[PDB]
């Protein structure tokens, strides 16, 4: 059981703002209740599923394509206009295309006996919505803060693993350098002893 | 300028629900406007910074402690009473076995309730809009952070597993380079034994 409360401007009353409350079950296609209020009075109407299917046919539109138009227009490139006569309680809206507009919807609303009850329920629904949202934003704010920390934590854990690797790397190399260079000392020594011996043999050959 | 709209029940009409709207600038301490409505009529009252602190004196409470009680009672066990005939509004606190008047206001019946009710509804819809947007922004950050975390965690896994393969991988190479030095040392010894 869903609902959307939107604010709208009527052509015959550009000064004041009105509110539209549409409520349905599952989909608009199965039918919906529409209520118009100016904060003092309220007008209500119903549209059955069959009424929707028929209106779609009378408008030469594919049903789902028609319900799509209703969504964009009633549940808030697509320009829509709304009209209402307090004297007849007739409510209708048109879609304004280029130089060509057309009746999109028409409802004969009935002035409600209990405006206040209707307005109170509407405001009550809005406040409950504001409430449910805050709870959610708070639950997300904590989850945000938890992740900010959980990242900072592993980030450090990372830097430490990397720093530990570098310290171990240089540490190993340092030991290697020593041993390798000690052998190079031996090689240089033996190398030069061999040259000495070579020059010795050459002296024996020359004299 | 901030505001809070609470749903309340009056003692003399447990049946119907009423709405209390309180608005202010910065802190209630500098004065506030309170509006009561039943969706048809509306009653308003202004409480000046002067009056508030005046009340904090009559009680003998720090202006701070006193404003604190109002925040708990007006911005939402607290009891509310209203007489449509006198427009007098008062609320009390109820503790275990006792209750006491916590405050009151002389409200005045508004001339154009519909205007007030329309502005209240408008505010609620804007709030629902703003809150739904934030719920999206925070919902994505929650996603970014989730990803960013996995990233680094992966880096960690890879880094720790590399510090554990180091000793073993560097030592083999050392053995290789080292063996070469040894072979050269052997051949040189060998050549010195030649002559």
């Amino acid at each position: 059981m869903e609902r959307k409360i939107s604010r709208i401007h009527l052509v015959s009353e550009p000064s004041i703002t009105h509110f539209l409350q549409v409520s349905w079950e599952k989909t608009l296609e199965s039918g919906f209740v529409i209520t118009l209020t100016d904060g003092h009075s309220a007008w209500t109407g119903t549209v059955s599923e069959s009424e929707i299917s028929q209106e779609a046919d009378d408008m030469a539109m594919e049903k789902g394509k028609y319900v799509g138009e209703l969504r964009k227009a009633l549940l808030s490139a697509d320009v829509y206009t709304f009209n209402f006569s307090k004297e007849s309680a007739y409510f209708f809206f048109e879609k304004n295309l280029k130089d060509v507009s057309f009746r999109l919807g028409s409802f004969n609303l009935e002035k409600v006996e209990n405006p206040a009850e209707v307005i109170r329920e509407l405001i009550a629904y809005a406040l409950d919505t504001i409430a449910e949202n805050q709870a959610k934003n708070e639950h997300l704010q904590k989850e945000n803060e938890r992740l900010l920390r959980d990242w900072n934590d592993v980030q450090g854990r990372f830097e430490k693993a990397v720093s530990a690797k570098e310290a171990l790397e240089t540490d190993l190399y340092k030991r290697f350098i020593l041993v390798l260079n000690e052998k190079k000392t031996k090689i240089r020594s033996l190398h030069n002893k061999l040259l000495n011996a070579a020059q010795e043999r050459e002296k024996d050959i020359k004299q | 300028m901030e505001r809070k709209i609470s749903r309340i029940h009056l003692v003399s009409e447990p049946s119907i629900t009423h709405f209390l709207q309180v608005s202010w600038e910065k802190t209630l301490e500098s004065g506030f406007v309170i509006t009561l409505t039943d969706g048809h009529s509306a009653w308003t009252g202004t409480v000046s910074e002067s009056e508030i602190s005046q009340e904090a004196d009559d009680m003998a409470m720090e202006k701070g402690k006193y404003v604190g009680e109002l925040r708990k009672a007006l911005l939402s066990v607290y009891t509310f009473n209203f007489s449509k005939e006198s427009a007098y509004f008062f609320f009390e606190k109820n503790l275990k076995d006792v209750s006491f008047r916590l405050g009151s206001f002389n409200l005045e019946k508004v001339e154009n309730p519909a205007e007030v009710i329309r502005e209240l509804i408008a505010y609620a819809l804007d709030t629902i809009a703003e809150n739904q947007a934030k719920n999206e922004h925070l919902q994505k950050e929650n996603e970014r952070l989730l990803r960013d975390w996995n990233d680094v965690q992966g880096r960690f896994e890879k880094a720790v597993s590399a510090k554990e393969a180091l000793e073993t991988d560097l030592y083999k190479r050392f053995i290789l380079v080292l063996n070469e030095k040894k072979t050269k040392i052997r051949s040189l010894h060998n050549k010195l034994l030649n002559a």
Binding site: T170, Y173, K174, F176, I177, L180, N181, K184, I187, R188, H191 | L170, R173, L176, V177, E180, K181, K184
Partner: peptide, 28 residues
């Protein structure tokens, strides 16, 4: 006589951090 071994490490001149890292990386 050769100056370097099959891996690029000198048989005669001492080495150090920078040079050995080069030799190792060359070993796969």
């Amino acid at each position: 006589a050769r100056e370097y071994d099959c891996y690029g490490d000198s048989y005669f001149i001492d080495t150090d951090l920078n040079q050995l890292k080069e030799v190792f990386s060359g070993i796969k």
